[PDB]
């Protein structure tokens, strides 16, 4: 019903938003008397210094912290520092049979991709027939993985293919 104040606020185009002060605050401070509605001091520096500057994007850090201790990830030659951010050089040190460490180079944390790249595979897989079967199984599983993810999905599929294709 009181659209008059609405059309008046619409009229309030000029920059001098101080006439409303003299218009309203006299009666407001008269009938309401909280001159200090917040006498608590408020002086904090918003941005002094806050940055990691000493590691990779911590997203993959928090991800890899969840994985099973049977996966041992290390650091490769420095080519995945910030943008690529991942050189998944992992060892499956556990009670199961060991194998060749995967590469699994994923992309920036935006994740418009996954990890499996398999650079050093060309000679690591075709040499051993059993490892060749392992690679075949791992490829067939990865192709059936809809939009696999950085560390969890890739490493899980790799381990399950390695310990399923034993036969």
């Amino acid at each position: 019903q009181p659209l008059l104040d609405a059309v008046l606020a619409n009229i309030r185009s000029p920059v001098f938003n101080h006439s409303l002060y003299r218009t309203f605050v006299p009666a407001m401070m008269a009938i309401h008397g909280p001159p200090i509605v917040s006498p608590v001091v408020c002086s904090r520096k918003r941005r002094f210094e806050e940055d990691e500057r000493q590691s990779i994007p911590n997203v993959l850090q928090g991800e890899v912290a969840r994985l099973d201790p049977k996966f041992l990830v290390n650091l490769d030659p420095s080519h995945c520092s910030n943008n690529g951010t991942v050189h998944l050089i992992c060892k499956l040190d556990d009670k199961d049979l060991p194998s060749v460490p995967p590469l699994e180079l994923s992309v920036p944390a935006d994740y418009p991709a996954q990890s499996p790249m398999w650079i050093d595979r060309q000679w690591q897989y075709d040499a051993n027939p059993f490892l060749q079967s392992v690679h075949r199984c791992m490829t067939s599983r990865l192709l059936q993985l809809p939009d696999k993810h950085s560390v969890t999905a890739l490493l899980n599929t790799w381990a399950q293919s390695i310990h399923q294709a034993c036969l």
Binding site: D5, A6, R12, Y21, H32
Partner: protein, 266 residues
């Protein structure tokens, strides 16, 4: 007298109306702090009017209106004010009323949240039973009766609305061995054990046995039999089946969680 809650709601509503008026007049006492693209904060002004539209919520009180218009001049309260002027110490009565109500609600909440018991275990009367049965019989549409034809145990029968009467044998408490029989009953000369049903009432008896084994408390059989009677009386409708259609199976009856729903749903 739930009208007290309605009047409290009206008080909260009018206080919210006053607060909204104050807030909108205070917001009008300030401009665009930092917009830099458009003073869209003026739309919040319109939003503030919505809170002023909450004044129409106070108009909802007209539905809650006409709560009290009677005689009864303050319900037997005036003793010293309208009576002996020298009797000024009256308000002690109201103080005691408030104290008792506060204690009641406090202990109620305390017992309700004390379900997390901490006692591991306990290690280092037919007249009372009939009286408990008669006291439990005090609810409407729940005509029960007992006869004890055989044994010192209790033989109790219940008939609420239909011919679906149920018998429950008790041992002065924790009445086990339930048997429901829809439309016949006490054949021969006393209660029977036919337990015949339509493949659904037998399921109801299974549910009752499950509840008895479930609602069994370590002591205080009064609360036990009270929960039992409420759980049985909750079957007065048998006409709705949420979480599914009305025909999920032969019949959809299982209110173990204070609400009926479609059967075969655990």
């Amino acid at each position: 007298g739930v009208n007290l809650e309605a009047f409290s709601q009206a008080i909260s509503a009018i206080q919210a109306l006053r607060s909204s008026v104050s807030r909108v007049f205070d917001c009008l006492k300030d401009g665009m702090r930092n917009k830099e693209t458009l003073e869209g904060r003026e739309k919040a002004f319109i939003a503030n009017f919505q809170d002023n539209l909450h004044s129409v919520n106070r108009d909802l009180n007209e539905l809650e209106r006409l709560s009290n218009l009677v005689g009864k001049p303050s319900e037997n309260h005036p003793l010293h004010n309208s009576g002996l002027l020298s009797l000024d110490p009256y308000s002690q009565l109201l103080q005691a009323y408030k104290w008792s109500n506060k204690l009641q609600y406090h202990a109620g909440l305390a017992s309700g949240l004390l379900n997390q018991q901490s006692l591991k275990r306990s290690a280092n009367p037919q007249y009372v039973d009939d009286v408990i049965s008669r006291i439990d019989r005090m609810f409407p549409e729940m005509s029960i009766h007992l006869s004890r034809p055989n044994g010192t145990s209790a033989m109790l029968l219940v008939t609420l609305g239909k011919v679906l009467k149920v018998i429950v044998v008790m041992r002065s408490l924790f009445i086990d061995r339930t048997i429901v029989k829809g439309y016949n009953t006490e054949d021969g000369k006393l209660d029977i054990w036919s337990k015949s049903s339509y493949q659904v009432f037998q399921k109801v008896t299974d549910h009752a046995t499950t509840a008895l084994l479930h609602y069994q408390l370590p002591q205080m059989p009064d609360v036990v039999v009270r929960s039992f009677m409420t759980w049985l009386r909750s079957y007065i409708k048998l006409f709705q089946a949420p979480c599914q259609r009305c025909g999920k199976f032969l019949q959809d009856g299982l209110p173990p969680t204070w609400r009926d729903f479609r059967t075969l749903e655990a």
